[PDB]
Amino acid sequence: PNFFKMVEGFFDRGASIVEDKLVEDLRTEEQKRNRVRGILRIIKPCNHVLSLSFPIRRDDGSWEVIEGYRAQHSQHRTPCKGGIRYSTDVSVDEVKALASLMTYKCAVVDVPFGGAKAGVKINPKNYTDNELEKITRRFTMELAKKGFIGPGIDVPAPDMSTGEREMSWIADTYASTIGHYDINAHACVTGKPISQGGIHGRISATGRGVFHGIENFINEASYMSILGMTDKTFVVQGFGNVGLHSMRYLHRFGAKCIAVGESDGSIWNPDGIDPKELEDFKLQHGSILGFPKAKPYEGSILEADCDILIPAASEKQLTKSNAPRVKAKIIAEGANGPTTPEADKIFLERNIMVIPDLYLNAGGVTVSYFEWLKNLNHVSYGRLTFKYERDSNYHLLMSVQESLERKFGGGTIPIVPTAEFQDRISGASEKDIVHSGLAYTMERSARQIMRTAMKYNLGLDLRTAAYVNAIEKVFKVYNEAGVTF
C-alpha cells in the first residue's frame, strides 16, 4: 500500500478512537454534539492544490515545459510549511499525502504551522546549474503570483533532492521581485546559507532530534519495566545524514554500535565502531565497503541481535515477511514509513516497542521554525545577552566567594568555573540556543504523547497515541475558532 492509504487509515482510526471522548468531555445541548463531528470531516481533505506548467530557455536554445505541484492541507494556522522535491516520480497523490502528514507532524511538536508540499517533475542530473537556477526562479515567480510563497502564507524548505543553493535562489528572487516592499522578505523560505540568513546547527538537527526522542523514552521506568530493559546496543540501517548524526550522538553518550548497513554490503563488529573513523573512511572514497577492523556481515542486519534498531533508510524496509524474525525490542523510525501496518500488528503481538516517525524526526521542522523566528527578529540569537549573562555569573561567583571569606575568618576562590563551564562561556554561540530549544520541544512532546497514551488505555501503540494527540490539538483550534461565515 502507498502512503495515501496508510495516512487515511491512520487518521480514520484516530478519529474513531477520539470521537467518543471528544463528544462529552469537551463540549458545553440536545445531544447533537455528534452532529458537530462533521468538523472531523473538514480536517481530512486537503484545502488547496495547484498545478503549474511553465517554460524555460535551456542552454542550447530549445524551449522546454516543466510541470510542478504545490499542495496546502490546512489553514487553521496561517503560515504553511513544507519541502520541495525535484523528481520525475512526483504526483498529486504523493504531495497531498505528504502535506496531510505535515500538519500532524507540526501539531505534535506544538509548531504553529500548517502543512504543505511541493514537487517538480524534473531530473536534476540532466541539467546544467544555469538551467536549474532558471527553473527555480521561474517556479518561485509562478508560486508568488498565486499566493503560495509569502512569509506569512507559505514557507518552503529543502528536501533530499534539493539544497541550500535552491533556497538562496528562491529567497533572492522573492526579495528582488515581489516582496520588495516587505520588511520580512527574507523569511519566505527556510534552509538558506548562513550568509543569506540561515541558522546555525541546521545540519545536525535531525540526528540530535532522533537521539533526544530515543533518550526520552528509554529513561522512563514504566515502559522499561514492560520491555524488561535497564547496557546499550544499537544497529543503524543507513549511513546518510540522519544515520551518521544519530550514531555520533548515541555513541557520545555511552552507547555501542554493533552493525551498520547501507544499500550495498553491511558491516558488523561486536567491539563497536567509531563514528569518526567510519565518517573519515566514507568521505575518503565511496562507501564503507572495506572498512578496517570490521567484518563484511552477510544477510540483512535487521535480524541481528540488538537492543535498538534505527531503520533510517528507504521506504518500508520492514514488512510482514521479516517481522516475526527481528530480534530488536525497540525500533526507532528514523525515516518516513519504514514499516507496514501488518508489521505494526505483528510487533504489538510480541510487545515490540515502535517509536513513531511522526514524532521522532521533527527536529528539522523545529529548527526551521527557529530559523523563521530568527529571520523575523532581524538579529541572531544571544547577541545581546551573552556578555550580560557572563557578568552576572561572575558576580554571583564573587558574591559566594566574599560570603565564604567573611565567615571562616583567607584563601578561597569559588570564582573559578569548571573546565566544561569555562568552555561553554568562552565558546558561546547561536547554535546552543537552537539545541536547547530542540531538546525542550522533544521532551515536552514526549511527555504529552505519554500522557495521551495513558489516557486512552493504549499500550505500546505510540503511533495511534500521537495521531490522537494531533487530532485533538487541531480539533480544539477548529472548535474554538467558531468557523467563519
Closest CA to 301 of 288, 293, 311: 311
- The verdict on 26 binding a copy of itself (CB under 8 A) reads no
Torsion of CA 105, 110, 116, 120, to 10 degrees: -70
x/- string (CB under 8 A) for a copy of itself, residues 109-148?
A: ---x--------------------xx--xx--x---xxx-
Closest CA to 429 of 385, 382, 377, 391: 382
Residue 36 or 226: the one with the smaller Cβ distance to a copy of itself is 36
Applying CB under 8 A, among 25, 31, 35, 283 the residue interacting with a copy of itself is: 35
Q: Has 146 been labeled as part of a binding site? A: no
Adjacent-strand bridge partners of 408: none
Near a copy of itself in 145-164, by CB under 8 A: 145-147, 151-152
Near a copy of itself in 91-110, by CB under 8 A: none
Return the range that interacts with a copy of itself (CB under 8 A); candidates 60-68, 236-244, 257-265, 266-274.
Answer: 60-68
Helix (H) or strand (E) run with residue 116 in it: strand 116-120
Q: Has 200 been labeled as part of a binding site? A: yes
Q: Has 447 been labeled as part of a binding site? A: no
Q: Has 284 been labeled as part of a binding site? A: no
The minimum distance between CB 212 and a copy of itself, in angstroms, equals 11
The C-alpha atoms of residue 202 and residue 388 are separated, in whole angstroms, by 26
Near a copy of itself in 365-394, by CB under 8 A: 370, 373, 376, 378-379, 381, 383-389, 391-393
Please report, for residues 19, 29, 32, the alpha-carbon distance to residue 35 in angstroms, rounded to integers and kept in the order given: 11, 11, 5
Contact 320, 299 (CB under 8 A): no
Residues whose CB is less than 8 angstroms from the CB of residue 294 and which lie 6 or more positions away in sequence, other chains included: 267, 268, 269, 273, 288
Contact 141, 169 (CB under 8 A): no
Near a copy of itself in 177-236, by CB under 8 A: 177-178, 180-185, 193, 195-196
- The verdict on 61 binding a copy of itself (CB under 8 A) reads yes
Q: Has 51 been labeled as part of a binding site? A: no
Contact 429, 95 (CB under 8 A): no
The cell 529571520 sits on which residue?
375
The minimum distance between CB 213 and a copy of itself, in angstroms, equals 16
Pairing verdict, β 116-120 and 64-72 = antiparallel
Residue 221 or 481: the one with the smaller Cβ distance to a copy of itself is 481
Applying CB under 8 A, among 12, 59, 64, 277 the residue interacting with a copy of itself is: 64
The C-alpha atoms of residue 331 and residue 354 are separated, in whole angstroms, by 5
DSSP calls for 305-370: --SEEE--SSTT-B-TTTGGG---SEEE--SS--B-HHHHHHHHHTT-EEE-HHHHT-HHHHHHHH
Total chain residues near a copy of itself (CB under 8 A): 106
Closest CA to 449 of 283, 217, 259: 217
The C-alpha atoms of residue 190 and residue 183 are separated, in whole angstroms, by 16
Near a copy of itself in 243-272, by CB under 8 A: none
Residue 211 or 234: the one with the smaller Cβ distance to a copy of itself is 211
Applying CB under 8 A, among 31, 41, 253, 283 the residue interacting with a copy of itself is: 41
The minimum distance between CB 389 and a copy of itself, in angstroms, equals 7
Q: Has 186 been labeled as part of a binding site? A: yes
- The verdict on 485 binding a copy of itself (CB under 8 A) reads yes
Residue 111 or 267: the one with the smaller Cβ distance to a copy of itself is 111
For 383, the grid coordinates are 547577541
Near a copy of itself in 461-480, by CB under 8 A: 476-477, 480
Q: Give the three-class secondary structure for 330.
A: strand
Applying CB under 8 A, among 17, 23, 224, 397 the residue interacting with a copy of itself is: 397
Helix (H) or strand (E) run with residue 479 in it: helix 462-481
From the number of C-beta atoms within 10 Å of its C-beta (0-12, 13-18, 19+), residue 316 rates as middle
The minimum distance between CB 69 and a copy of itself, in angstroms, equals 10
The minimum distance between CB 391 and a copy of itself, in angstroms, equals 7
The minimum distance between CB 310 and a copy of itself, in angstroms, equals 24
For 48, the grid coordinates are 488547496
Q: Has 391 been labeled as part of a binding site? A: no
Q: Has 246 been labeled as part of a binding site? A: no
Helix (H) or strand (E) run with residue 235 in it: strand 233-237
The minimum distance between CB 99 and a copy of itself, in angstroms, equals 12
Q: Has 374 been labeled as part of a binding site? A: yes
For 200, the grid coordinates are 546555525
E-only strand ranges, 57-110: 64-72, 80-86
Return the range that interacts with a copy of itself (CB under 8 A); candidates 28-36, 116-124, 271-279, 293-301.
Answer: 28-36
Residues tagged active-site: 117
Task: Tally the C-alpha atoms within 13 A of residue 458's C-alpha that lie toward its C-beta.
Answer: 24
x/- string (CB under 8 A) for a copy of itself, residues 426-455?
A: ------xx--xx-xxx--------------
The cell 545540519 sits on which residue?
203
Annotated binding site for ADP: 380, 444
Annotated binding site for substrate: 81, 105, 368
